[PDB]
Ligand binder design. Structure first.
Ligand SMILES: [Cu+2]
Length: 305
């Protein structure tokens, strides 16, 4: 917190580093989520091509989002209040002991410009010793940006459930998500799963001509970082993306709805060739419910915490 680093560090003619660091916060109670924003210093298009975590020891988890309207203009805030008022687009997730895993060579997220995010929003989640004379913490992430066009553009394919209810006691409830893919090819290289306490497992697949290829499979009670996809999965025009979240209602007194409460989110991080690329994409439907009768057995086997 006596760093001399400077928020923008020029690197060479076309690149700069952005240091995104909590402005000296004091985590009070445990499980505390703090948020801060950082404006891109350029107006034109740039590419985020690398990330370096600068985490304290006590930092459990960090997320980085791109958006155009952070939820506060304050120095920092509590993320309970929200991340961005507009769509918060996840770019990066770090968890202690997870390998955060790198952007592949030639891949960048596109920001700035007419259609790219104007701000980053950083979230830092703290795990706290009750002495320390109000310790100041400046955890965060350094971001590497370039104005040199990248050949491959990263983006997020967000699958989410909204139609499903968990009746009390049911032990096993499936929430299924599926959409037809109709863009240029995307190549999936990482995934993140999100659910609250009732989630057991979250699985994502590419389905082509009735054959299922796993994108990724994880227990959402583990740290919600981005996990790497072993061998990147090409998703192409005509494929279906399918995801299933497995819930419990055991110990529940009343029904639980999948709506912010429970959630079934699968973040599929991809790249696409630059000239055909888009930054986002979402599925919020179950268009092919019948196909889940053929889902691989593995999508139902638990992954204990
Ligand atoms: Cu949630």
């Amino acid at each position: 917190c006596l760093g001399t680093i400077g928020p923008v560090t020029p690197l060479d003619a076309s690149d700069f580093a952005l240091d995104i660091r909590m402005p000296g916060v004091t985590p009070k109670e445990s499980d505390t989520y703090f948020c801060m924003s950082m404006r891109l210093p350029v107006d034109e298009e740039a590419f985020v091509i690398d990330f370096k975590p600068r985490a304290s020891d006590t930092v459990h988890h960090m997320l980085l989002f791109g958006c155009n309207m952070p939820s506060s203009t304050g120095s920092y805030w509590f993320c309970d209040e929200g991340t961005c008022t507009d769509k918060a687009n996840i770019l990066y997730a770090w968890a202690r002991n997870a390998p955060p895993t790198r952007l592949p060579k030639g891949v960048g997220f596109r920001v700035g410009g007419e259609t790219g995010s104007k701000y980053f929003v950083l979230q830092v989640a703290y795990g706290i010793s009750a002495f320390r004379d109000n310790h100041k913490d400046c955890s965060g992430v350094s971001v590497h940006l370039t104005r040199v066009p990248q050949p491959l553009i990263a983006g997020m394919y967000l699958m989410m459930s909204v139609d499903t209810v968990i009746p009390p006691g049911e032990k096993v409830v499936n929430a299924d998500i599926s959409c037809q893919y109709k863009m240029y090819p995307m190549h999936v290289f990482a995934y993140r799963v999100h659910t609250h306490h009732l989630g057991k497992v979250v699985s994502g697949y590419r389905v082509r001509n009735g054959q299922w290829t796993l994108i990724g499979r994880q227990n959402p009670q583990l740290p919600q970082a981005f996990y790497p996809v072993e061998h990147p999965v090409d998703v192409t025009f005509g494929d279906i993306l399918a995801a299933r979240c497995v819930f419990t209602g055991e110990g529940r007194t009343e029904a639980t709805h999948i709506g912010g409460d429970e959630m079934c989110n699968l973040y599929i991080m991809y790249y696409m060739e630059a000239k055909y690329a888009l930054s986002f994409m979402t599925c919020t439907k179950n268009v092919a419910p019948d196909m889940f009768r053929t889902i691989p057995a593995e999508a139902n086997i638990p992954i204990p915490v």
